[PDB]
Design an enzyme around this catalytic site. Structure first.
Site, PDB file in Angstrom:
ATOM      1  N   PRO A   8      15.249  29.377  16.074  1.00  0.00           N
ATOM      2  CA  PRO A   8      16.004  29.985  17.176  1.00  0.00           C
ATOM      3  C   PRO A   8      17.192  29.147  17.673  1.00  0.00           C
ATOM      4  CG  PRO A   8      13.630  29.948  17.619  1.00  0.00           C
ATOM      5  CD  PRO A   8      13.901  28.989  16.481  1.00  0.00           C
ATOM      6  N   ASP A   9      18.283  29.823  18.040  1.00  0.00           N
ATOM      7  CA  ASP A   9      19.514  29.170  18.563  1.00  0.00           C
ATOM      8  C   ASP A   9      19.293  28.823  20.040  1.00  0.00           C
ATOM      9  OD1 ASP A   9      21.967  28.607  19.757  1.00  0.00           O
ATOM     10  OD2 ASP A   9      22.810  30.594  19.375  1.00  0.00           O
ATOM     11  N   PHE A  10      19.323  27.527  20.370  1.00  0.00           N
ATOM     12  CA  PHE A  10      19.084  27.030  21.751  1.00  0.00           C
ATOM     13  C   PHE A  10      20.189  27.502  22.698  1.00  0.00           C
ATOM     14  CE2 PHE A  10      16.243  23.158  20.651  1.00  0.00           C
ATOM     15  CZ  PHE A  10      15.116  23.885  20.956  1.00  0.00           C
ATOM     16  N   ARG A  11      21.340  27.897  22.151  1.00  0.00           N
ATOM     17  CA  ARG A  11      22.472  28.362  22.995  1.00  0.00           C
ATOM     18  C   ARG A  11      22.342  29.869  23.243  1.00  0.00           C
ATOM     19  NH1 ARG A  11      25.431  23.789  20.111  1.00  0.00           N
ATOM     20  NH2 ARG A  11      24.810  22.129  21.555  1.00  0.00           N
ATOM     21  N   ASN A  33      23.405  21.671  14.232  1.00  0.00           N
ATOM     22  CA  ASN A  33      21.942  21.910  14.100  1.00  0.00           C
ATOM     23  C   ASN A  33      21.195  20.577  13.995  1.00  0.00           C
ATOM     24  OD1 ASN A  33      22.750  24.574  14.024  1.00  0.00           O
ATOM     25  ND2 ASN A  33      22.382  24.835  11.831  1.00  0.00           N
ATOM     26  N   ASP A  57      17.773  20.821  12.725  1.00  0.00           N
ATOM     27  CA  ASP A  57      16.592  21.422  12.042  1.00  0.00           C
ATOM     28  C   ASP A  57      16.381  20.780  10.664  1.00  0.00           C
ATOM     29  OD1 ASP A  57      18.500  22.751  10.368  1.00  0.00           O
ATOM     30  OD2 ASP A  57      18.527  24.475  11.736  1.00  0.00           O
ATOM     31  N   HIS A  74      24.947  16.468  16.828  1.00  0.00           N
ATOM     32  CA  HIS A  74      23.862  16.442  17.847  1.00  0.00           C
ATOM     33  C   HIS A  74      22.592  15.797  17.268  1.00  0.00           C
ATOM     34  CE1 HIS A  74      26.475  18.589  20.510  1.00  0.00           C
ATOM     35  NE2 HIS A  74      26.582  19.620  19.665  1.00  0.00           N
TER      36      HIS A  74
END
Ligand SMILES: [Zn+2]
Length: 279
Positions: free
Chosen positions: A40-43, A98, A100, A117
């Site tokens: 899932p995209d945290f943004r 990402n 991940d 990040h």
């Protein structure tokens, strides 16, 4: 500046990529390239991540990690397309937002990657005098048994190498940017809405002549009315192209134009099978 694309289409980009002018490709990637793998995209809505707090209370973050642990680490078509770029000798760098680790599992090496990040692939003792490096396998269990990860040497907190709020950006980012964007022949932007800074600004570090392809579900990178953003549609548009849909389907379409589709198909099938077997 000058026009290197004969046409502002994926077909025009594919021909430029096959021409002698395109030697060095930079990829700018975000959450969009990882959504089809089950990350899932945290943004996306579809304190805890502050550094000062985490060192005081790490349990909430590791509890959230235990919960939002993906289940299987399988890179997508888009990830293996970037491995194809590398195999073809066209990949200068992949700049990823990402964490991940799917870039590394797809077979991009640490020197190919700028993880703006950070990453979960590597973890470190938070003690400056120690900084014992622990792999993702070591961290997995520690998050699994809900046993806070502590250093085997000095018993300090062990933090995954991701950039929490309050932490500075990897110097690698600024150093690589200064060098990489003097050399880039094509900017391949995939699965990012280009809303987060200073990652978004990377697109303006491309030379004026450098073509830029966006592969995304919606268009992005255009200058906000509320120096030079993405210009796909205006009368002045000369180098920027947008392909709208799944990042995977877009990369598959580009591979098809380049004659890579079978090589990409065979790579994704072979690697997915390998991961499925040992998972
Ligand atoms: Zn230690």
């Amino acid at each position: 500046s000058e026009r290197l694309l004969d046409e502002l289409t994926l077909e025009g980009v594919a021909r430029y990529m096959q021409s002698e002018r395109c030697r060095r490709v930079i990829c700018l990637v975000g959450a969009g390239i990882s959504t089809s793998a089950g990350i899932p995209d945290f943004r996306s809505p579809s304190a805890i991540f502050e550094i000062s707090y985490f060192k005081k209370h790490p349990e909430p973050f590791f509890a959230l990690a235990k919960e939002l642990y993906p289940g299987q680490f399988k890179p997508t078509i888009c990830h293996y397309f970037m491995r194809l770029l590398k195999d073809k000798g066209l990949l200068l760098r992949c700049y990823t937002q990402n964490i991940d680790t799917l870039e590394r599992i797809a077979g991009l090496e640490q020197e190919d990657l700028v993880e703006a990040h950070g990453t979960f692939y590597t973890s470190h003792c938070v003690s400056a005098s120690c900084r014992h490096e622990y792999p993702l396998s070591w961290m997995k269990e520690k998050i699994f048994s809900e046993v806070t990860p502590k250093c085997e040497d000095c018993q300090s907190l062990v933090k995954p190498d991701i950039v929490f709020f309050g932490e500075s950006l990897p110097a690698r980012f600024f150093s690589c940017m200064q060098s990489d964007f003097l050399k880039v022949d094509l900017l391949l932007v995939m699965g990012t809405s280009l809303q987060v800074q200073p990652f978004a600004s990377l697109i303006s570090k491309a030379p004026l002549s450098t073509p830029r392809l966006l592969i995304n579900k919606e268009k992005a990178g255009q200058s906000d009315p509320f120096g030079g953003g993405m210009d796909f549609d205006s009368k002045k548009a000369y180098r920027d192209v947008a392909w709208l849909g799944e990042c995977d389907q877009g990369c598959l379409a580009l591979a098809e134009l380049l004659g890579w589709k079978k090589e990409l198909e065979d790579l994704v099938r072979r690697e997915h099978a390998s991961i499925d077997a040992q998972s």
